[PDB]
Amino acid sequence: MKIDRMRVFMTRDKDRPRVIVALDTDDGLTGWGECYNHGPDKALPPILDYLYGFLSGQDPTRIDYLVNLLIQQSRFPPGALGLSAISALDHCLWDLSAKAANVPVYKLLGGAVRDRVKVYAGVYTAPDAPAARDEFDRLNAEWGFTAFKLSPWRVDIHAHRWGNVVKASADYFRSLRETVRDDYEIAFDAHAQIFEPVAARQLGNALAPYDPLFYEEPLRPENIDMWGDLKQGLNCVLATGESLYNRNEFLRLLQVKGADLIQPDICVVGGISEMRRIATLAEAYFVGVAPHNPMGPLATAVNVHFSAATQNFRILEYRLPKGQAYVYGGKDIEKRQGETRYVVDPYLPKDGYLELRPDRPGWGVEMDEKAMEEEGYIHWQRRVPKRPDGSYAFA
């Protein structure tokens, strides 16, 4: 069969826009993909139109052949926006190929190496311990979650003395352990807001006695070598990588021993084609994979197949299709809710795992094209915090 159409849907996932892509073939199949939402999503359709020129008329079962063509035609390494678009097209090609062979996508990735996919709940704020307990328990009662991710920050880190900022985080984690179920796993996402390796190490070591599931992305991404310096003398599990794009950025991170766990995003790195290479590198370095995934239900389905096939996969970030809207940080459980409807039958957790759908080819979800047509673009941007002297810090 040959690729003969692309359809691009500008829709949304609660309060973030989302571009969803279909590739159709002359045998009547369709494969689906999800772009990351970097910010200016209206840039994605023209990128996709340009990339489609290299896919028209081609055999979609030549997945790596075509994805590599998309990478090579730019010559320059594609960045955030380009790779987001490439990611969605990679997803479409895997989905088409699996549908053509009448198998779940994981059968094209070496097969399932596990029966279900562990998830943690993206909570993302820093609520007081009793409120955290109640929310964790609610999530456990509904979906079986026993792993959760919070922000460590209990004050504005630029408006208080650093020792007090760190003590507030340590006291907070202590409180959580005194309050919530002993078996619950709690990760902290520092969200790339720390400048100095030494400061990141101090915070990590203050959290360490209370067993963070992982300590995610404390520093900025551009200098990879400094991650190796951070991790020397760090007593907790260090996770990073969500902001890295390709096999070679991850290779450098691994070579400097800059992470214990890596967190590539399958909508950011160029899809499964690149995600698999990244995970293979990590595996040889004895580093696990916890995919970054604040994206929507189609991205989640793509993650389910990658995660099911990858030996060194450990746990998957998960946001409920009906639930909390965008947030990072703050003293509350986020009040804003939304409902993401572009997947008819999203993967939902059972006992804190997503279960495979072995009798369904492709991703194992159906798309709701009417819902995508009903809900269009919405503007979304990050707030970059400021210091008291008026300078900008880090999102």
> Which residue in the block uniquely carries the two structure tokens 């929310």?
135
189 is catalytic: yes
Q: Segment 120-159, which members bind Cl ion (CB under 5 A)?
A: 142
Compute the distance between CA of residue 129 and CA of residue 172 in angstroms, rounded to an integer. Answer: 7
With CB under 5 A, what is the number of residues at the site for Cl ion?
A: 1
> Which residue in the block uniquely carries the two structure tokens 């951070």?
230
Compute the distance between CA of residue 35 and CA of residue 163 in angstroms, rounded to an integer. Answer: 40
| Residue 141 within binding range of a second copy, rule CB under 8 A | no
| Residue 221 within binding range of a second copy, rule CB under 8 A | yes
| Residue 395 within binding range of a second copy, rule CB under 8 A | yes
Task: Report in angstroms how near the CB of residue 144 gets to Cl ion at its nearest.
Answer: 6
Binding-site member from 7, 116, 133, 357 for a second copy (CB under 8 A): 116
Task: Report in angstroms how near the CB of residue 295 gets to a second copy at its nearest.
Answer: 13
Task: Report in angstroms how near the CB of residue 297 gets to a second copy at its nearest.
Answer: 21
191 is catalytic: yes
| Residue 289 within binding range of a second copy, rule CB under 8 A | no
Binding-site member from 50, 323, 326, 345 for a second copy (CB under 8 A): 50
| Residue 198 within binding range of a second copy, rule CB under 8 A | yes
Of 24, 41, 191, 217, catalytic: 191
Compute the distance between CA of residue 123 and CA of residue 332 in angstroms, rounded to an integer. Answer: 10
Residue 190: what residue type?
Answer: A
Binding-site member from 57, 111, 130, 144 for a second copy (CB under 8 A): 111
Following DSSP, what letter does each residue of 5-63 receive, concatenated?
Answer: EEEEEEEEETTEEEEEEEEEETTS-EEEEE----S-GGGHHHHHHHHHTTTTT--TT-H
Of 95, 217, 242, 317, catalytic: 242
135 is catalytic: no
Q: Segment 51-80, which members bind a second copy (CB under 8 A)?
A: 51, 53, 59, 61-65, 68-69, 72-80
Task: Report in angstroms how near the CB of residue 74 gets to a second copy at its nearest.
Answer: 6
The answer for 166, left when phi > 0, alpha when psi is -120 to 50, beta otherwise, is alpha
| Residue 359 within binding range of a second copy, rule CB under 8 A | no
Q: Segment 160-179, which members bind a second copy (CB under 8 A)?
A: 160-164
Distances (CA, A) of 358 to 91, 287, 305, 306, 351: 18, 28, 11, 14, 19
Compute the distance between CA of residue 30 and CA of residue 300 in angstroms, rounded to an integer. Answer: 18
Of 34, 189, 274, 334, catalytic: 189
Give me the half-sphere count of Cα atoms (radius 13 Å) on the Cβ side of residue 78.
22
Task: Report in angstroms how near the CB of residue 64 gets to a second copy at its nearest.
Answer: 4
Q: Which helix (H) or strand (E) is 148 found in, with range?
A: strand 147-150
Task: Report in angstroms how near the CB of residue 194 gets to a second copy at its nearest.
Answer: 9
305 is catalytic: no
Compute the distance between CA of residue 265 and CA of residue 268 in angstroms, rounded to an integer. Answer: 5
Residue 229: what residue type?
Answer: D
Of 265, 274, 334, 375, catalytic: 265
Instruction: Give the residue numbers annotated as catalytic, written as ranges.
Output: 189, 191, 216, 242, 265, 292
Judged by the rule CB under 5 A, the positions of this chain that interact with Cl ion are: 142
